[PDB]
Structure formats: C-alpha cells, structure tokens
C-alpha cells in the first residue's frame, strides 16, 4: 500500500494473510467472507511465469493479523487449505480477466474482536455504491513503494470506465474496475505488489455494513500520476462465488 497510513486494531477484521509454508514468505492479501471461506486473487495461487501454481498443502492463511512479521499469540489464527477454487475463465496469459479465487479452510475460525467476515454485495448495493467518484477502502501488507511493519489502509475513489481504459494499453474487461485519484485532484494513494487478494471494501450508508466490492488484481507501477490500480469486480463474478460456497452442507 503506497501513500497510506497504519490500520487501527480491528479496522479490517476480514483481512487475511496468504502465507507460503516453505520457505516462510508473505505471498498475498485475502478476505474473510465466512468462518470457512477466504476470497483472494487468482494470480496469488496461479501465475505460472512466477512459478506460482500452488496446491492445497503448499499454503496457509493467517487471519486476524495486524503486524506483518510478528506472530500474535491469542490474536491471529492459522488455518490450512482444504480446497482451492479458481474461476473457470480466469485469464493469466493476457489481462488477468476474472482474477478471483476461493479457499476452503480445513480449520474454521472463531469470530473475535480481530476476526470478522465481510459482506458480499447484493445487486442493489453494488449498483448503489460501485459508482464513479465514490470512495472505497484498500488494505494490505504489500510494498510501500515501487523500489510495512503493520497493515496499511488507503481510501480511493472509483474511476469511470473511459478514464480507466485510456490510462492503460492492457485490455480492460467488465470484470474489472479501476480506482485512485486523478492527477488534477492533488491527493494520492494506491495498492502495490503484495496487496493482491486484498479486499476493496465500501461501507453502506443504508445498513452501515462493510461490503467487499473488489479484489486487488493488477496495475502498472504504484501511485503513478495518470495511472490507476485495477480491481476484480466481485459482484460481476458473484454467480461463480455462489456456486462454489453453496455446494456443501454446513
């Protein structure tokens, strides 16, 4: 997270750290949508050029964390992965279209002050909130610059589609949205490498719940003028998310 600030404790209780077993390495961010299911970006799990093609027993999730490096005794919860789910039409070779992956946990987590799930948006909420000029929130332990000790937080306005499309040469899809300040708006901030899988959340003024509208997917550099971070459109792909989660008995 570039040009942001430290998270408050319990500010992002749905924040999940995707962690490699061997060697011990922070891999990606992620979101907690139930005691059992974790949402992330697909290129965290499957991006073959970077030797990323992980199976279930390669990875673990760390839930409820604030510190990047420090283990937190009675705060964080570590769970193994039962099954990895990647969108059927995920496109890693071109533009990271449908950059979305679900993870089933072997060990379900108990909710606390530091652990709590984020809502997935229904159609009306997504239509009412996912609009240009409206600000969302991005969290992560990713890079502070292009080149943190604790979780980082930045609020970014959703950018209209023509501006997202013109800012880049990479092909834009309706399964994406971009966010960030325009150069003539003065303010700044962006996601960066390491932030992927991290939630792009918005607070509803109607029921004052937090909804995850996006997943940190891709971008060109970090916090560059005239450039915008691109996010997986969660609701556009909510039809796949529904099929995966509603499959099994409780």
């Amino acid at each position: 997270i570039v040009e942001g600030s430290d998270a408050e404790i319990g500010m992002s209780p749905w924040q999940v750290m995707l962690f490699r077993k061997s060697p011990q390495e922070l891999l990606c961010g992620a979101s907690l949508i139930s005691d059992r299911w974790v949402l992330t970006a697909a290129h965290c799990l499957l991006y073959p050029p970077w030797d990323k093609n992980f199976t279930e027993n390669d990875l673990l999730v760390r839930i409820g964390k604030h510190s990047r490096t420090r283990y937190e005794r009675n705060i964080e919860k570590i769970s193994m992965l039962e099954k990895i789910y990647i969108h059927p039409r995920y496109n890693w070779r071109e533009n990271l279209d449908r950059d979305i992956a679900l993870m089933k946990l072997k060990k379900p987590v108990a909710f606390s002050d530091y652990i709590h799930p984020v809502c997935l948006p229904d159609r009306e909420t997504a239509a009412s909130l996912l609009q240009a000029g409206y600000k969302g929130r991005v969290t992560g332990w990713g890079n502070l610059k292009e080149t943190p000790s604790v979780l980082q937080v930045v609020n970014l306005p959703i950018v209209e589609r023509p501006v997202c499309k013109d800012s880049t040469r990479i092909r834009i899809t309706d399964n994406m949205f971009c966010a960030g300040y325009k150069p003539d708006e003065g303010k700044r901030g962006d996601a960066c490498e390491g932030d992927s899988g991290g939630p792009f959340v918005m607070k509803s003024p109607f029921n004052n719940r937090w909804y995850q509208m996006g997943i940190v997917s891709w971008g060109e550099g970090c916090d560059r003028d005239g450039k915008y971070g691109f996010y997986t459109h969660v609701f556009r792909l909510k039809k796949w998310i529904q099929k995966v989660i509603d499959q099994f008995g409780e």
Binding site: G10, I33, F111, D113, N208
Partner: peptide, 28 residues
Amino acid sequence: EADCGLRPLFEKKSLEDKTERELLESYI
C-alpha cells in the same frame, strides 16, 4: 455471514474509525 460487515471494535461499539467519514462524504 449473517452478522457480516459489522466490526466488533467499531460498528458494534458505535465507534467511528479514523477515515470512515471520507467514504460517507463521497456519496454526494
């Protein structure tokens, strides 16, 4: 899942976070 999006240390405590208002004010 039924209690999603309500933070124990914020919404459930009736406490506003550091930059929460930046989101609410952008809906104009």
